[PDB]
Amino acid sequence: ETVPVKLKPGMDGPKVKQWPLTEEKIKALVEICTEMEKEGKISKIGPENPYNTPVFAIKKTKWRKLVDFRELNKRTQDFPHPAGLKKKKSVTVLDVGDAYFSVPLDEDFRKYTAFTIPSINTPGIRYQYNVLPQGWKGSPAIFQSSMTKILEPFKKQNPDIVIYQYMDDLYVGSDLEIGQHRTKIEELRQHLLRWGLEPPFLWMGYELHPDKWTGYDPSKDLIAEIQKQGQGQWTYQIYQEPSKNLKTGKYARTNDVKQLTEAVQKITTESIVIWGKTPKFKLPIQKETWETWWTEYWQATWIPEWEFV
Numbered sequence: 001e002t003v004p005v006k007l008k009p010g011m012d013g014p015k016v017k018q019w020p021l022t023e024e025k026i027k028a029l030v031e032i033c034t035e036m037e038k039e040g041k042i043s044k045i046g047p048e049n050p051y052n053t054p055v056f057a058i059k060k061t062k063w064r065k066l067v068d069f070r071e072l073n074k075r076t077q078d079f080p081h082p083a084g085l086k087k088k089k090s091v092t093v094l095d096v097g098d099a100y101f102s103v104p105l106d107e108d109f110r111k112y113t114a115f116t117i118p119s120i121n122t123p124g125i126r127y128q129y130n131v132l133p134q135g136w137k138g139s140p141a142i143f144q145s146s147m148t149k150i151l152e153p154f155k156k157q158n159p160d161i162v163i164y165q166y167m168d169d170l171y172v173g174s175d176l177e178i179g180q181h182r183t184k185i186e187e188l189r190q191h192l193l194r195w196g197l198e199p200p201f202l203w204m205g206y207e208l209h210p211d212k213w214t215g216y217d218p219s220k221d222l223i224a225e226i227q228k229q230g231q232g233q234w235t236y237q238i239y240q241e242p243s244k245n246l247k248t249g250k251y252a253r254t255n256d257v258k259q260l261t262e263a264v265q266k267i268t269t270e271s272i273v274i275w276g277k278t279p280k281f282k283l284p285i286q287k288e289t290w291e292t293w294w295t296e297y298w299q300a301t302w303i304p305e306w307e308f309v
Contacts, residue, residue: 003138007112014112056068058298060095067133092185093207094188099143099197099199105131158174213249215244223282224237225309234259257289257293280305281307283306
């Protein structure tokens with residue numbers, strides 16, 4: 001059985017142009033998509049489908065596909081965050097996005113997930129999803145019940161570990177001694193493999209220590225500003241009303257966009273840990289300079305919204 005999904009009343013699906021990619025990124029995307037197609041997760045389509053969402057490829061040997069569903073997400077219907085996560089000595093971020101590929105996507109909604117692998121030449125290759133896609137806000141919401149069953153035996157044996165999922169990421173928090181924390185993360189990886197997950201980047205662990213980090217309305221949106229200082233030094237604030245800050249910080253570095261891009265990722269990760277939401281950024285940089293370079297330094301599996309200022 002599949003979950004029926006609608007766009008928000010009054011909205012059509014996304015029609016976002018694919019941006020130019022290097023020959024190397026295209027090659028990688030073609031191999032990834034060929035295998036997804038073989039595996040039935042996507043299907044080729046033609047120009048009868050008017051929708052489109054951008055795709056590119058990142059490196060964290062192996063490229064990873066990254067579909068920029070920011071517009072589709074804004075257009076999709078609406079469907080818990082642990083307060084203790086930010087309190088844990090260590091939080092390790094795992095990538096598990098391959099998990100969504102086992103659940104079919106409402107046949108009526110598939111057309112809206114269309115994307116285009118550009119070509120060096122010709123228009124390029126168009127596909128749409130048949131299965132819950134990575135990066136789409138409905139996929140965790142539909143899969144939520146199944147991931148609870150998968151995690152439940154592990155949570156039962158480890159009641160003091162906090163596990164929180166945001167999109168493709170699992171955030172796993174413990175107060176254990178660092179060696180023991182890391183060994184428990186491997187135990188969780190192996191638990192997931194025994195339940196069928198085979199995510200190619202699961203082996204990596206991105207390690208946070210939020211207890212060492214520096215009035216919130218869930219309905220409200222989080223906003224982040226960033227200011228360039230100097231010699232690789234940036235400052236930021238997260239708020240909801242410009243005066244009433246919820247967090248402030250500094251990131252320290254090479255070029256600016258690369259540093260700004262790392263700062264944006266770091267700030268978003270903190271927001272996800274603290275509140276479970278990505279903020280909307282006000283970026284101190286020119287649109288065209290940002291757009292030329294940010295994908296060269298992006299390593300996250302999500303993408304926040306941004307504006308330029």
